[model samples]
Target: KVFERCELARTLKRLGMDGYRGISLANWMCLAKWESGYNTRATNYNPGDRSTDYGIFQINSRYWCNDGKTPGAVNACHLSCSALLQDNIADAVACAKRVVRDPQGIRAWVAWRNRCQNRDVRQYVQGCGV
Candidate 1:
């Protein structure tokens, strides 16, 4: 459709992160359309209590910035949005990848309990062949 789409697809292919490990293009498109309308600069209304990390990926500024996880660390605001703005598709795909890696996802700490190594998206998120 556009460079953004191609870039996103390319990034996904490179990172091997396709829609929560193959969550289906339909679902992915739906989430992207609503999450930010494919807008990397898209921001949320309520930013945590103190840290306010905004942007396409919705990086939590409060946690990554003010929480002082890393001394002298600037939150998501200071991070470069170019990856999202310049390459929206890539950025979105990256976020999706991160989401799948979340603790709640199949690939989280729980999934490790099994013996699944070097698996695909379905395996990691769906836990079919663990």
Candidate 2:
């Protein structure tokens, strides 16, 4: 399921990101745009690492999720990477929170590092009325 941009912002706000600073709705919106283009079924396979990134947040199988096929996956989120591909994003959000809490913070997301970092992404949530 691909969310309309504003709907995604609203959903992020409803998920308790309304003004929460470490990573805000706008940041999430921007990150999602770059990471997976808001497509819940998105995945990116890394041939070098033999790993895969899954879902809207592109949670990685290396340390965050178990694809059940990655040989040394840490499964830090304690869930299957396949679960993040579903339209229902509760699990993705939960795992993302865990990712953000780690030392890397939101910068764990390469999209966030390359596109969202140190930039004013307020436009991402503009008119969403969150």
Candidate 3:
């Protein structure tokens, strides 16, 4: 679902997460950019750890999903890793909300930690009106 930044912002707002307190639209935008470039089909395999990250949010097979190919996956999200690759993104967003609720909060994403945390990210949603 190769969404533009503003399109993603509007979509997230519609999903009831625009300003829900913990994570903001700008933070999401930053994550979308760094995680998957707004690509729903994006995936990454880490040979070093034999783990694969999937979809726009980069949900991990090591914990949140079962890639089938990855042994010892926890499947914490109770979903197939391939499910997150869909363009609809509803399931992905739902699973991501669960991840955010973990003790680490938004810091669950390394991209968020590096780019969004403690940063003034207003520019990421400058003209989107989200």
Candidate 4:
């Protein structure tokens, strides 16, 4: 599922992402926008490291998911990468929650650091009353 920007913002907010681990809804929105363009089934493979990023949050096989082929990778989220690709987003949302609980917080996703951090992200949630 590819969500509209405000639609996704409200969804994340409903899932309690507004301020999870000190990360705002807009920050998560920005991360999702740049990472996967709001597509639930989005994926990217990193050939250099033999890892794959999966789902809306683009959780990586190297540190977060198990795709069964990422060498030296650990499934910190203890879930199959396939689960992240579901349109339902239950697993993706849960794993993303676990991700931010890490010491690095939302910066666990570098895209958030590069694109969302210090930027005016309010627009990501300006409408829809989330």
Q: Name the lDDT value of residue 8 in candidate 1.
A: 43
lDDT over C-alpha atoms for residue 129 of model 4: 92
* Alpha-carbon deviation at 9 in model 4, angstroms: 1.5
Per-residue accuracy of model 1 over 1-130 as CA lDDT, tens digit each: 2325444444444555444554543334333433454556665544335443234344544433233433344533333433444444555455445555545553332222243324232422232221
Instruction: Quote the positional error of residue 40 for candidate 2 in Å.
Output: 0.2
As for TM-score, the candidate ahead, 1 or 3, is 3
Q: Which stretches of candidate 2 lie over 4 Å from their true place?
A: 19-21
My TM-score estimates for the predictions, one after another, are 0.44, 0.94, 0.93, 0.95
TM-score of 4: 0.95
- What is the model-wide C-alpha lDDT for candidate 4? 0.88
Indicate the residue-level lDDT of 98 in model 3.
Answer: 75
User: Which ten-residue region of model 2 has the weakest summed lDDT?
Assistant: 15-24
lDDT of 2: 0.87
Worst 10 residues of 1 by lDDT: 121-130
Model 4: how far residue 48 lies from native, Å: 1.0
* lDDT per residue as tens, model 2, 16-95: 86545466688888989999999999999999989999999999999999988777879989998889999988899888
lDDT of 4 by residue, 48-71 (tens): 888989999999999998888989
Best of the two (2, 3) by TM-score: 2
Q: After superposition, how far is residue 15 of candidate 4 from its true place, in Å?
A: 1.1
Model with the higher lDDT, candidate 2 or 3:
2
lDDT, candidate 1, at 95: 46
**Candidate structures ordered by lDDT, highest first:** 4, 2, 3, 1
